[PDB]
């Protein structure tokens, strides 16, 4: 295809995408296909001659869409939101023409330059401590990573390299491997699986810190674990504190664990992949207090700040401890929405979260398990885990809305996450009515 | 922005991208900006109110473009090609609406299903051994990774896990760390830096195998290194053989090193990130002979098969040893070009490579350093390294074309890589005339 035909087909695809988005409430949010559905519907080999664009788009509607989970449907309340905004989409189109690979500054200067400025824009929007900013010859700075999982891995490897060099300087008699089997990393028992993944990749031990009644990491639990592990010969070197846990959106207490990590010379990485976006609002910035103690901080604009994946924003206090023109998406989103537009987006989602919480709190058959702070509500029917497993199965099997659960200690808990860019109060109210009706069916069945 | 405004701005961006592509030969391929140029031209903070789309696109032309290295200009002959095709661009637009995160099948079934089929399509196009295919209940299969660097890391970690379990089964007296400081990985002395990066991440030693006169890894050099390292107590566990080295597009001899790796129980990973795309052509498939001995194989459609980054295709013989709907781009590209369209694209680039080689071979002031096989020509002025460093500096400073060099043993060598989708014989001839003129200037200066 040449540019003249792209002029036609590109505008046709713009209309197709806009049509899909405008009619997305008519789509069943979760598909009815079963594993392996697609292979019988597609030829076994690539075509030798070209297919037509019309044939391909027809296949998207007929055989791709039936297997799509519509993350941007207003009735998608699962996991955490995925960012999709038209400003980011417009930037991605330009990236296909002027993006490259960005491994060096000379690969394309604009790519590296814009990223440095955009991370300063975002760092100032979050009112981050100035030690994290690229700006005004600060020793710190930010980079865009592909994912929070990658950012956590990068922080662990930087911490691993630093502690090996430190221990070898103190005792030149030590090899890297002898240090390796004594290193231990820490995280909450509510930490995302990416922490364990990073520990396995890095080849170090990982231990979970028991959380308190609010599922937060506290000084007393951390000090108890350090006392045990240091006596056993382990060397704490890395810590992932989480602001906005994937299970219940709880917050580790940075004001308590930060000073401890600094004292112990433990690299403190703050994983705020979801919750970090809300810290651009002054009423939520207090949830980030204590980040001044962290050695690295990370959150995903590609969850809840409307910058289409991939865009994971990581700041490090000292850059010396440490691609797709992904900063173009950030630039577009920040400029076409403005800081106030992004703040209104965050606040609407949090308002809608409290609206669902209000409905659950009106039904004494249910209970709220964790304090509602951002766009997540953790709730369950009072009683057995099995009645709640039945409720979740009935919900996801009806495929009108989509939820995922979690385990809080031994308790099976349902999650309600505000996700879609276009979700409204009516969608939240309808979802609750659906959940309430199915709960009556499930409660009926348990007593009969 | 809502969908109705995206209808307008999306089609406007289609026209802007098409205009850029159609006029790209009027762009200076490499920019004249210096590091730090962008920050004074952009405000220090994000706007509170939204900016207009017109303001943003004007900024792209006025302040972004001057710092862009135009990888898709016909006069870009540096590194290796970056894939940019309109079929892939059309798929990326749809991915912004129906893509998600694809961590599980249930996250969006179509994403996982299409990837499995597309890797079988591509595996059959490469005539890969059937042990690599997802198809017909084969134990092997392919996945799309974000980069060849990531694919090599994934293979190393899989090899690391397997050898630790094997040695602990043979000797339960061993810890993971005690095994770690004995493991050694291998690669050619022409291997990409990603191999060293993977070894550092994985925490294992890496040693280079000396290449032969054709810069290929051979059985004799590998056996010499194994004899030395096994006697020293090292445990070979992982090997990266390269088809199409980044320095000079040489090819490690798989028919020789494959059987050795199988005997030694060394995981053989084949890195063919650039050259792999040509193996869809029968006249180049012989360069892949011996892949039947490999445990994993990888190449980048996002270099030289027109599938916009990111798309790295990795096959593993046994899947049990082991996101963005990136398979949609593969599906679109394969269908709108056809196998024959992709074959014609590969063959044109190789023809153009031989056309440049023919011109260099007509000038006895120059020499060809390595056999020309695919879209890369390694050449230099006869004589000192310094006269060649001067030639490269004069070339890249004129900014009419863009080249990068490499070192072959102690020899400074210039690379000429066919990159752009729209490069023609006229562009290659003009570049040679430019190189020839600057060589006269530089040769003059050395003798005066």
Author numbering:
A (entry chain A), B (entry chain A): 1 to 322, 355 to 480
What does the paper say about this structure?
Aromatic amino acid decarboxylase (AADC) deficiency is a severe inherited recessive neurotransmitter disorder caused by an impairment in dopamine synthesis due to the lack/modification of AADC, the enzyme converting l‐dopa to dopamine. Patients exhibit severe movement disorders and neurodevelopmental delay, with a high risk of premature mortality.
By combining several structural approaches (X‐ray crystallography, molecular dynamics, small angle X‐ray scattering, dynamic light scattering, and spectroscopy), we determined that both variants alter the flexibility of the structural element to which they belong, whose integrity is essential for catalysis. This change causes a mispositioning of essential residues at the active site, leading, in turn, to an unproductive external aldimine, identifying the molecular basis for the loss‐of‐function.
